[PDB]
Structures are given as C-alpha cells and as structure tokens.
C-alpha cells in the first residue's frame, strides 16, 4: 500500500497530477528491519 | 527529485512534410477506392 499526494500542487500545466509523491515501507537487507521510502510515480502506474 | 520545472514530454512533427506525406497516401488509397470518393482520417477509437 502506498500513501500518495500530488508532486506539484502549484503547477497548473497540462502535467497536473500526473506525477505523484508516494510513501511506502518496502523492505531492507535484513528480514527484521523496515525503512520508509519516498518516490515519485506517474499516474498511469498507480491505481487508487 | 525533478529539478527545474515539471514539463510534458512531446514530439514535434513538421506540418508541411506530414501534410504532403498524407496527401500521397490519400492518392494511393484512391487508386483502390475510386477517383470520386472521400478519404477521411480520424483518431483511434477508445481502448487501452
């Protein structure tokens, strides 16, 4: 599960809401640990 | 991170070259459909 907001709220260009800033836990080298990863995804790859 | 402004990806195609190329395609299609027909190009229908 990813928690996402728009990458640029200010932008009014045609590319509005296409890039989303998503946060997720993913995994680490060790089984017992987790991290927090922030990354950008395109709207076409992410479904609500 | 996206540095600078967020911009839309796009292609530039010269209008005159495309118009001449398409006209040539129309002439060759007329050879199979007739000299008194109308050839219309339109956008692709909805789908993936």
């Amino acid at each position, epitope marked *: 599960t990813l928690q996402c907001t728009n990458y640029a709220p*200010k932008l*009014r*260009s045609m590319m509005r809401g296409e890039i989303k800033n998503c946060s997720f836990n993913m995994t680490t080298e060790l089984r017992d640990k987790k991290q927090k990863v922030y990354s950008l995804f395109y709207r076409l790859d992410v479904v609500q | 991170d996206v540095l600078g*402004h967020v911009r839309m990806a796009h292609c530039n195609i010269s209008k005159a070259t495309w118009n001449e190329t398409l006209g040539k395609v129309v002439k060759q299609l007329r050879k199979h459909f007739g000299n008194n027909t109308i050839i219309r190009f339109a956008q692709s229908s909805g789908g993936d």
Partner: antibody
Amino acid sequence: VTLKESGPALVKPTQTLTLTCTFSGFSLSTNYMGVDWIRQPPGKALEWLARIYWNDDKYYSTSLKSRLTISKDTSKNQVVLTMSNMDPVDTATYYCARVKLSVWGVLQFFEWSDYGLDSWGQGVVVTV
Amino acid sequence: YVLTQPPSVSVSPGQTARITCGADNIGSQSVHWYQQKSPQAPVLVISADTERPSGIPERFSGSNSGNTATLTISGVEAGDEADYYCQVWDSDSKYALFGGGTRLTV
C-alpha cells in the same frame, strides 16, 4: 512597459462607462503578455474587474458578469472596458495593468505561470 | 475561497512586520503581494510567494504554506509603511481574487 488609461471623469446614473487603455512597449497577439482592469473605490481595497490574455481568452469577475464587457484591438494597441448601469457605488479609481506571464515550456500545454502585475498605469477617477 | 488579511500591523522602526493572507488551501496557489502608498497604482513587491522583483529592497521576503501565506518585511522604516494587498489567480474558476488589504504603521 507603459500603460495609459483614458475615460470620462463624470458619469450620470445608468450611464455606460467606457475606459480605453493604450499600451506602449508591448503589444497583444505578438508577445505572450495579457492585460486586465482593476478598480479601487475611495478608501477601499482593490477590486478585480476582468482580464484579457494574449490568446483572446476573456475572463470576468463573477460580480460583474451581467454588466462588464471588454474588447481588444491590436491595430490601435488598445483595450476597451465598458460597464453598463453605472451606480454611485461604482465611484472608483480605475486602472489597467499588464499581466506578465513567465513561460518555460510549450504554450500548447499551458506551460507558464502568472507572474503578477508588475507594470500598472496611472488610472482615471470615475465619479457617478 | 476568501483571502483574509489583518486590518493592520503596527511595528517599531526597524522591527520586522508579518502581513498574513489566509484562505483555504492557499498553499496550493501562488500569492502575489503589492505595496500601495499614495493613491496611485501599487507596485508588485512579491511575485509567486518567493520571487523579489528587481528594484525592490532586500527587506521584502515571504513564504506560503498550508492555510497561511506570509509577507515578511524586515527593517521597517518610515518609507516602507503602506497598505499591502495579496492577490491570487484561481485557475480552477479562472479569475483573480483579492484580499482586503493590511495597513502598516511605524
């Protein structure tokens, strides 16, 4: 970038007000700059009236949609604002100003930002 | 969507004044700031929250986040006090919305 307003000083009730703003240093439909109109009643904050963009787009304040009309003539380097049914409450200093847009990408994709009103005219005072 | 400004900010000479402009989700739109002294058209002091137009003293700065936009003017002198206004162009409704103005007092 100079803008100069002209119009009547005295307006009768119900009379239509006409304001003309002449541009110097820029022109519409050549560059990507727009022009709008703002009014300021005496002792009150500025009230936005309406805007015209370089691409013939026209926008109006929701309070004056039934009364305010604007037009552009690029051969004269002029913009005209008109308002029907002028009322005593409409006494104000009227200004025209240049809407400067910062363009970084493709205009077809609206790749620009509203930079604000950097250059204003001097305005006229209209009393109804 | 309404832009709410304080009616005034009163400061000592040289003290920093904070002129705010609140509205729901103001941090999602660019806020312009203007300075009006004499009954003449105002001069733009802040462009898109963080850009200082050329010719404006370094005393002028600002930011915009959440529900509050702020104009910070450090080093206030007798020559700076003015009625300051916030303006936002709302692309969603395609019109410019103006605040009520804030008067500075030295």
